Amino acid sequence: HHWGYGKHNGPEHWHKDFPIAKGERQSPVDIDTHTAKYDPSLKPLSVSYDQATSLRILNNGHAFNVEFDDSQDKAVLKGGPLDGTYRLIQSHLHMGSLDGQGSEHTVDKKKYAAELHLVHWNTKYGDFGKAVQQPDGLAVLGIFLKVGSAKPGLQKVVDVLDSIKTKGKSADFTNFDPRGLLPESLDYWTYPGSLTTPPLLECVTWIVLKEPISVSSEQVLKFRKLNFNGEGEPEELMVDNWRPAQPLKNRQIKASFK
Ligand SMILES: [Co+2]
């Protein structure tokens, strides 16, 4: 079978096809605020998404995805713990089957209903494929979702989710603004980690936003109606596609706030 989140192909199995699964820099991790430490050396985080330009949304059988045009520095990430410019290439959503779970990272063991990931690559490598092969090739912004008031920025995509219900489906979508996913505050935690899905490469500088954004019950439920399976196959809801917290292995989690 292909890796996934089921009993026979889930996170606990990954290590057999990807030994790195048991690495020293694996993600996600639980953010222990008693341990996380404020770092003065961190510069202001710069999230320039004004020129952002989305291309399409798609169901790859692993999570809801949206691809961006990364040919130019239209939507980039700089500052914070980053050296240079990191270009936004894609974003995906880790969702739970229940409100009390779904987020990959946890804060003092607390899980959120979901977690969005905005992936950027170090332009110093000229290509996303080459960046993932480097320790500092990726910068992923993590954003926690909790239920409550509806997130205006999510409604547009939420209304067309049926067009990418099953694996392998995709739909053009040029108006997905990642700016509309950001919380008010940009306070965050950083730490060296990896991709949270195979190949689990440890090429990521994680920037997890402290403040979660709100999404309505209805928006969450629409996201939970997506399928892991393909068309014609037995329905398997795309829920609980999150990897649990991995060992911190003495890595240091830095806070951008006092
Ligand atoms: Co992810």
From Swiss-Prot:
Changing residue 119 to A/G/I/L/S: Reduced CO(2) hydrase and p-nitrophenyl acetate esterase activities. Changing residue 62 to G: Impaired activity, not rescued by 4-methylimidazole (4-MI). The lineage of its organism: Eukaryota, Metazoa, Chordata, Craniata, Vertebrata. Disulfide bonds: none annotated. The active site is at 62 (proton donor/acceptor). Changing residue 60 to L: Reduced activity. Catalyzes the reversible hydration of carbon dioxide. Can also hydrate cyanamide to urea. Stimulates the chloride-bicarbonate exchange activity of SLC26A6. Essential for bone resorption and osteoclast differentiation. Involved in the regulation of fluid secretion into the anterior chamber of the eye. Contributes to intracellular pH regulation in the duodenal upper villous epithelium during proton-coupled peptide absorption. Changing residue 140 to F/Y: Strongly impaired activity. Keywords: Acetylation, Cell membrane, Cytoplasm, Disease variant, Lyase, Membrane, Metal-binding, Osteopetrosis, Phosphoprotein, Zinc. Its EC number is 4.2.1.1, 4.2.1.69. GO terms for biological process: angiotensin-activated signaling pathway; carbon dioxide transport; morphogenesis of an epithelium; neuron cellular homeostasis; positive regulation of cellular pH reduction; positive regulation of dipeptide transmembrane transport; positive regulation of synaptic transmission, GABAergic; regulation of chloride transport. Its main location: cytoplasm. It is linked to Osteopetrosis, autosomal recessive 3: A rare genetic disease characterized by abnormally dense bone, due to defective resorption of immature bone. Osteopetrosis occurs in two forms: a severe autosomal recessive form occurring in utero, infancy, or childhood, and a benign autosomal dominant form occurring in adolescence or adulthood. Recessive osteopetrosis commonly manifests in early infancy with macrocephaly, feeding difficulties, evolving blindness and deafness, bone marrow failure, severe anemia, and hepatosplenomegaly. This is Carbonic anhydrase 2. Activated by X-ray, histamine, L-adrenaline, L- and D-phenylalanine, L- and D-histidine, L-His-OMe and beta-Ala-His (carnosine). Changing residue 140 to H: Impaired activity. Changing residue 140 to G: Weakly impaired activity. GO terms for molecular function: arylesterase activity; carbonate dehydratase activity; cyanamide hydratase activity; zinc ion binding. It holds the Pfam family Carb_anhydrase. Optimum pH is 6-8. Belongs to the alpha-carbonic anhydrase family. Substrate binds at residues 196-197. Coiled coil: none annotated. Changing residue 92 to C/D/E/N/Q: Strongly reduced CO(2) hydrase and p-nitrophenyl acetate esterase activities, impaired stability of zinc binding. The modification Phosphoserine is found at residues 163, 170.
